[PDB]
């Protein structure tokens, strides 16, 4: 689950964050969650789940992954 979550929060083609680090929406997440990596990472996820494009990036559709059994489609 943590693997899926980190993937869904980075660029499947260029291997970096879908969202920018310097955006206020993530800067305030960092300011809010200090010493709570769980809350930090979950905030970043629920922020990034709406993102559907890699956009100094690679601009390619980042696929809505799924899981069945032990497998990632």
Partner 1 sequence: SARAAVSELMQLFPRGLFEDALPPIVLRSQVYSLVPDRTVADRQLKELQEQGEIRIVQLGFDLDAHGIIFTEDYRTRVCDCVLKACDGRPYAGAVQKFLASVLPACGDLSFQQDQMTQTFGFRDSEITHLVNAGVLTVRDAGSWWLAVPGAGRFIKYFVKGRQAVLSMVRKAKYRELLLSELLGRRAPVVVRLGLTYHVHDLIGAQLVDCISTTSGTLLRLPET
Partner DNA sequence: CTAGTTGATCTCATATCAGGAGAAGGAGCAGAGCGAATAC
Partner DNA sequence: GTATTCGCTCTGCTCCTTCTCCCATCCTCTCGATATGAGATCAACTAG
From the list 23-31, 41-49, 54-62, 65-73, the region that binds partner 1 by CB under 8 A is 54-62
User: Are 23 and 29 spatial neighbours (Cβ–Cβ below 8 Å)?
Assistant: no
Q: Quote the CA–CA distance of 73 and 59 in Å, as a whole number.
A: 20
For DNA, which is the closer residue by CB, 5 or 40?
5
Q: Which of 59, 69, 51, 61 is nearest to 9 (CA)?
A: 51
Give the residue ranges of the annotated binding site for Zn(2+).
Answer: 11, 14, 52, 54, 58
Give the residue ranges of the annotated binding site.
Answer: 11, 14, 52, 54, 58
Binding site for partner 1 (CB under 8 A): 13-16, 54-60
């Amino acid at each position: 689950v943590k693997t899926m979550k980190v993937l869904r929060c980075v660029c499947f083609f260029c291997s970096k964050l879908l969202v920018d680090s310097n955006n206020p929406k993530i800067k305030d997440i960092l300011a809010k969650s200090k010493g709570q990596p769980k809350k930090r990472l979950t905030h970043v996820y629920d922020l990034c789940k709406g993102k559907n494009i890699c956009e100094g990036g690679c601009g390619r559709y980042q696929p809505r992954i799924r899981r069945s059994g032990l497998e990632l489609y």
